[PDB]
Design a protein around this ligand. Structure first.
Ligand SMILES: *[C@@H]1O[C@H](CO)[C@@H](O)[C@H](O)[C@H]1NC(C)=O
Ligand SMILES: *[C@@H]1O[C@H](CO)[C@@H](O)[C@H](O)[C@H]1NC(C)=O
Ligand SMILES: *[C@@H]1O[C@H](CO)[C@@H](O)[C@H](O)[C@H]1NC(C)=O
Ligand SMILES: *[C@@H]1O[C@H](CO)[C@@H](O)[C@H](O)[C@H]1NC(C)=O
Ligand SMILES: *[C@@H]1O[C@H](CO)[C@@H](O)[C@H](O)[C@H]1NC(C)=O
Ligand SMILES: *[C@@H]1O[C@H](CO)[C@@H](O)[C@H](O)[C@H]1NC(C)=O
Ligand SMILES: *[C@@H]1O[C@H](CO)[C@@H](O)[C@H](O)[C@H]1NC(C)=O
Lengths: 1038, 120
């Protein structure tokens, strides 16, 4: 019944874990005695320096294609004199292979380009690859980081410098790929494909019809617009969006995937094809699509049509008359701006020989043949017609539809958005230019760069704690932002989203217009704190703030379509930077690369190579001056010794081997945790309950004990325990349950921030956060030891719990289900205690249900937020005043709450929680008091305009739920040669209070049959009963 | 003596007269309104047009000033309510109380008066 005095004692345990076991008070005292240098800036100086970095990378990027272009253009002048026709088949070079610097899939190289042949090439084709090897090698050796460099001729040959034996089971038709189309035809193409599947079309030739439609979709860019229509017996458009019934949508990967699946859903129909309605609909779409694109003209409209022998005998001519009439009428509303292309589907019988005449009449728009007079004094853009069979190469036929477009002879560089490499095994970006000799187009040249390398300057920008950067193009699409997933881990092209969605702040659309228009400038705006995202709030440097200033300093990158910007939070208030210090190492520094060393005594800590001899220090990719070079190239023992020498160099003599500013200063500043931790180990009784403790810094320093080996790409600044502590400065932050990276399974983490001084407790003053990890059962073992009331029964009718500020439970009477039998949010207060969850939603000012948009996975997330300023005690207000009284209060000094429930009789209470996914019950509206576990609803985005489908959806953006992380690998040869670091035998524990919390143990309660209670609960290693279910699967193999 | 329906969820169902205690031994309409409102998310999702009536006919049973006998819903409206909402209830954690099993209701049989509005 009493909870207050019980909560104060529980708070002392939290301080005993944060201050004594972790060392927060010691490190805060040390960081308070350090000296700092203050800086004030609006971002104009930083946006100038950062623009230079990527401009130099794009200048060298443009100098390669410009050099490759002038060589192949001059090489054609030699072709007019000597036969430049060599053959170096890419499938005939098998002496060896390599993986040096990208190209990591069976790639030989060094002054030997390879050629791939299209079926269109003739024996007298122009092949400049013979002499082009002399320059392609110098381009790669002088510019490391670029992946591919190629020349694809208009005739059909594809020559790439790094020769790799790839895709020999077919032909690589590069001329049908979007990179080639966007170069030779840089105009915004508003295409609409009409797919006739009526008149009893045989499924044998509808095969070609639907396969061709996939070639169009997989060949256009985001500046092109597309619509796909059906038989027109009923004008069925794509049903995956509301705007697809009215407009043409930009050919984004979203629209492509939606239209492509809609193509494969087409099956034959016996109704006679109503062609006139299909062409009419296509015009109505093209008409209602704004004036062209309102974008530098260059808007060529084309209507592709795929059909065969419809006729209809009696009304055949009438069917032919109705189409060419409505074409002449609707294309007469336009200024004959629409071009028509037709394609024939043929077997040896159906289409015969006379049905092709109706398709050429459509391409030529031969309306006068049927009487209808061309009312427009303008001419008509005569199209073209091609025939297709089961032997047709759809890429060299229908894929070359862009050739029928006007070639305005644009000689300009074009930059592609991030996409997946078809030759390699990663994401790339491509700059390209066409090759022009007189009025003749020879082809295009293009070089591919790794996405992580070209963006390494904006992905890991850390010049100031009060600043961050984002990179966009002139159309608004975001290429890099703190809210995006890091490119090195991406195996799929992201959903390209406008900057108005990631920088979701009121009054920002004014700054957005100034960014896309003015090539250089800056502007400050005033924003309230209650309607903003965390990237701004976490950098506040004044407490009790109701509104804050933001500075946006932008500058377009020279000679490219990209624009870089610097966001400075509260620029009128200084930002502190750690001054260079000189601390001598009390203990020897140990780099985390224990595999390359092998000198200290090693052991396994879950799925990690670790040691108990001393803690380790890790530098994340981003602390180095070239983060892509650190991720791509192997880290060797030689480099580990160099970094160890420079970081522990107290003579100030060793030159910087490749580290960034403030990196070593934070390594020395945090070097005091070594003696602090190791001293506590000798006297602590919690060595069997603490899985690890650590401290992390904004500039990439990570010291953990037990010193373990981590993956290079690990960034602790983007983990939940880090961001949760920054949001709650000066408070103990409970975070969990979450899945551990090291292999400990589900864990709960106490995290705390370290500030520049104790007189300023704002989030922006965070110079480091520390964290300590415990197993899932630990905080219930604490709850049973600390509070005797929780033992009146075995957590049955009298239940105790600990709830974080999001609603998730870290202490529990029940925590076993984690498997296939319970909802995904089963660890939430709404699922485990639906009654008190319903009741606390009625307590005023205590709870608030939040909505945020996550454009990375097109969902809208619902969550809770109990404000951690709760003074006093909360009991039943509406529900359960008689049958289930409860007491809920905040644990002082932390973001958690302690609760006790006394279930005297049964009561009815539900909180909706899906047991098959995370979909909310009602996705039409959100109610604050409608109890439901955390859930998601699909985000409705208008793909025809790039905005939200409903304007009544201006929620903030979900900052980060970046799940992808490389869990550390363990393998035989090491598993059998070494043993676990801590081997507290779980077989010798006979009660729940003894087994709960032990890091390598679990209290089994369920038999291997799935859900049958055990007559004999016992303690066993975690491997034997995950979640207490004997024989359950590991949580990493979900 | 009958009293008017006060719980807003059960207004506009066909009647506005009830009498406490109900079948669940709720001593007031406020107590009964708190329990029946736990099904309100299922009513707004429209899994069955009979759901709001079936729930209200049990938590706020109809009171006629001249009948003086309990007038429960028929078994047909209970089955039509569960046929459209039960599979959704099993997915989102909702459960029917055992006192609301359709076997406890009269069939459309004998002179047991029940309340189905589609068979009127
Ligand atoms: C729970 O309530 C009962 C009365 O229903 C009381 O006897 C018992 O002491 C209570 N338990 C606690 C821990 O308050
Ligand atoms: C066609 O050109 C005329 C000018 O001759 C212009 O007024 C009209 O708007 C154009 N058509 C469309 C659809 O814009
Ligand atoms: C936020 O605070 C402002 C005043 O600072 C207030 O007018 C507004 O109603 C609050 N809520 C929202 C959602 O803006
Ligand atoms: C913004 O800057 C001005 C000028 O320094 C200052 O007076 C003001 O307090 C700052 N904050 C807001 C919310 O205006
Ligand atoms: C919870 O937040 C409100 C404002 O949203 C604040 O006024 C209140 O004091 C907070 N709760 C407590 C118990 O202080
Ligand atoms: C809708 O999208 C367009 C770009 O297509 C953009 O210019 C406009 O600002 C968006 N609407 C709003 C309200 O932001
Ligand atoms: C009560 O229900 C009757 C229908 O049975 C309806 O006519 C009447 O308007 C209702 N009472 C009120 C106050 O609306």
């Amino acid at each position: 019944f009493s909870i207050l005095d019980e909560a104060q004692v529980l708070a002392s345990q939290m301080r005993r874990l944060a201050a004594e076991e972790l060392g927060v008070v010691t490190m805060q005292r040390i960081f308070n005695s350090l000296v700092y240098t203050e800086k004030i800036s609006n971002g104009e100086s930083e946006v100038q320096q950062l623009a230079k970095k990527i401009r130099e990378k794009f200048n060298r990027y443009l100098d390669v294609v410009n050099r490759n272009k002038q060589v192949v253009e001059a090489s054609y002048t030699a072709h007019l004199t000597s036969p430049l026709t060599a053959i170096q088949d890419c499938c005939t070079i098998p002496p060896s292979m390599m993986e040096f610097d990208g190209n990591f899939n069976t790639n030989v190289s060094r002054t030997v380009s390879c050629d791939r042949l299209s079926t269109t090439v003739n024996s007298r084709a122009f092949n400049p690859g013979r002499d082009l090897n002399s320059v392609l090698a110098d381009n790669l050796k002088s510019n490391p980081g670029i992946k591919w460099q190629y020349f694809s001729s208009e005739e059909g040959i594809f020559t790439v410098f790094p020769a790799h034996k790839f895709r020999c089971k077919g032909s690589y038709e590069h001329r049908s790929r979007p990179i080639y189309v966007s170069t030779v035809r840089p105009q915004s193409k508003h295409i609409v494909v009409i797919l006739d599947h009526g008149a009893s079309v045989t499924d044998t030739q509808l095969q070609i019809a639907k396969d061709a439609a996939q070639v169009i979709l997989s060949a256009i860019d985001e500046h092109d617009k597309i619509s796909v229509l059906t038989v027109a017996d009923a004008v069925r458009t794509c049903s995956l969006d509301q705007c697809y019934k009215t407009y043409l949508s930009p050919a984004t990967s979203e629209t492509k995937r939606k239209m492509s699946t809609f193509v494969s859903s087409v099956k034959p129909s016996d109704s006679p094809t109503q062609h006139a309605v299909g062409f009419h609909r296509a015009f109505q779409l093209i008409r209602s699509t704004s004036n062209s694109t309102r974008f530098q003209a260059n808007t060529d409209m084309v209507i592709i049509y795929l059909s065969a022998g419809i006729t209809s005998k009696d009304s055949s001519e009438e069917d032919k008359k109705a189409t060419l009439r409505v074409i002449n009428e609707e294309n007469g509303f336009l200024n004959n701006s629409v071009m028509i292309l037709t394609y024939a589907l043929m077997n040896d019988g159906v289409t015969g020989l006379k049905e092709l005449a109706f398709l050429r009449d459509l391409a030529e728009q031969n309306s006068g043949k049927y009487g209808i007079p061309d009312r427009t004094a303008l001419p008509v853009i005569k199209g073209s017609m091609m025939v297709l069979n089961q032997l047709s190469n759809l890429e060299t036929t229908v894929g070359r539809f862009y050739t029928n477009l006007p070639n305005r002879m644009i000689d300009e560089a074009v930059f592609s958005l991030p996409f997946s490499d078809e030759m390699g095994d990663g994401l790339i970006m491509t700059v390209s230019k066409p090759c022009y000799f007189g009025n003749l187009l020879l082809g295009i040249v293009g070089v591919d760069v790794n996405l992580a390398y070209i963006l390494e300057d904006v992905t890991y920008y850390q010049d100031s704690l009060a600043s961050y950067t984002f990179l966009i193009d002139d159309k608004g699409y975001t290429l890099m932002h703190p809210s995006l997933t890091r490119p090195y881990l991406l195996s799929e092209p992201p959903l390209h989203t406008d900057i108005i969605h990631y920088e979701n702040i009121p009054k920002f659309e004014l700054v957005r217009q100034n960014i896309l228009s003015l090539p250089l400038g800056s502007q400050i705006i005033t924003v309230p704190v209650n309607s903003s995202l965390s990237w701004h709030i976490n950098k506040l440097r004044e407490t009790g703030k109701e509104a804050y200033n933001v500075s946006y300093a932008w500058k377009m990158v020279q000679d490219t379509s990209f624009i870089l910007c610097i966001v400075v939070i509260q620029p009128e208030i200084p930002v502190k930077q750690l001054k260079n210090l000189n601390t001598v190492p009390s203990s020897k520094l140990l780099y985390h690369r224990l595999d390359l060393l092998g000198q200290p005594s090693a052991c396994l800590h879950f799925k990690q190579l670790a040691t108990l001899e001393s803690p380790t220090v890790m530098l994340s990719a981003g602390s180095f001056s070239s983060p892509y070079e650190h991720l791509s190239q192997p880290e060797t023992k030689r480099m580990v010794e160099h970094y160890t020498a420079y970081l522990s160099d107290n003579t100030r003599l060793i030159a910087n081997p490749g580290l960034k500013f403030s990196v070593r200063n934070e390594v020395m500043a945090t070097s005091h945790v070594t003696d602090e931790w190791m001293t506590q180990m000798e006297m602590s009784s919690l060595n069997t309950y603490i899985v690890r403790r650590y401290i992390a810094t904004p500039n990439g320093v990570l010291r953990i004990y037990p010193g373990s080996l981590m993956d290079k790409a690990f960034d602790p600044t983007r983990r939940q325990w880090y961001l949760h502590a920054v949001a709650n400065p000066g408070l103990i932050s409970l975070t969990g349950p979450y899945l551990d990276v090291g292999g400990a399974g589900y864990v709960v983490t106490i995290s705390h921030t370290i500030h520049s001084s104790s007189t300023q407790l704002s989030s922006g003053h965070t110079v480091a956060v520390m964290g300590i990890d415990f197993t899932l059962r630990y905080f219930y073992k604490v709850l049973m030891d600390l509070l005797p009331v929780c033992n009146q029964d075995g957590g049955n009718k009298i239940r105790c719990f600990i709830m974080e500020d999001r609603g998730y439970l870290v202490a529990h009477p029940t925590l076993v289900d984690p498997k296939g039998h319970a909802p995904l949010e089963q660890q939430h207060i709404t699922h485990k205690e639906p009654l008190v969850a319903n009741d606390i939603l009625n307590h005023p000012n205590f709870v608030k249900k939040n909505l945020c948009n996550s454009f990375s996975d097109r969902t809208v997330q619902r969550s809770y937020k109990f404000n951690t300023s709760l003074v006093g005690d909360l009991t039943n207000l509406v529900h359960g005043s008689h049958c289930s009284k409860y007491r809920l209060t905040r644990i002082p000094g932390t973001n958690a709450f302690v609760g006790i429930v006394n279930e005297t009789c049964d009561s009815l209470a539900f909180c909706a929680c899906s047991m098959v996914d995370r979909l909310c019950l009602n996705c039409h509206r959100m109610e604050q008091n409608e109890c439901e576990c955390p859930c998601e609803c699909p985000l409705e985005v208008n793909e025809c305009t790039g905005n939200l489908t409903n304007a009544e959806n201006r929620n903030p953006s979900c900052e980060v739920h970046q799940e992808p992380v490389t869990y550390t690998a363990i393998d035989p040869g090491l598993q059998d040669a070494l043993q676990q670091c801590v081997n507290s035998r779980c077989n010798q524990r006979m009660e729940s209070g003894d087994c709960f919390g032990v890091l390598d143990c679990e209290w089994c309660v369920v038999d291997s049959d799935g859900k049958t209670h055990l007559d004999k609960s016992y303690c066993a290693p975690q491997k034997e009963c995950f979640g207490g279910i004997v024989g359950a699967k590991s949580p990493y193999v979900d | 003596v009958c009293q008017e329906i006060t719980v807003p969820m059960c207004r506009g169902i066909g009647y506005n007269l009830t009498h406490m205690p109900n079948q669940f031994n709720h001593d007031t309409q406020d107590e009964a309104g708190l329990e029946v409102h736990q099904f309100w998310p299922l009513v707004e999702i429209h899994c069955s047009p009979d759901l709001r009536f079936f729930l209200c006919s049990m938590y706020t049973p109809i009171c006629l000033p001249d009948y003086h006998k309990p007038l429960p819903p028929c078994r047909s409206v209970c089955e039509r309510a569960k046929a459209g909402c039960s599979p959704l209830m099993r997915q989102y954690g909702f459960a029917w109380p055992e006192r609301m099993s359709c076997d406890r209701l009269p069939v459309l049989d004998a002179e047991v008066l029940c309340m189905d509005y589609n068979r009127s």
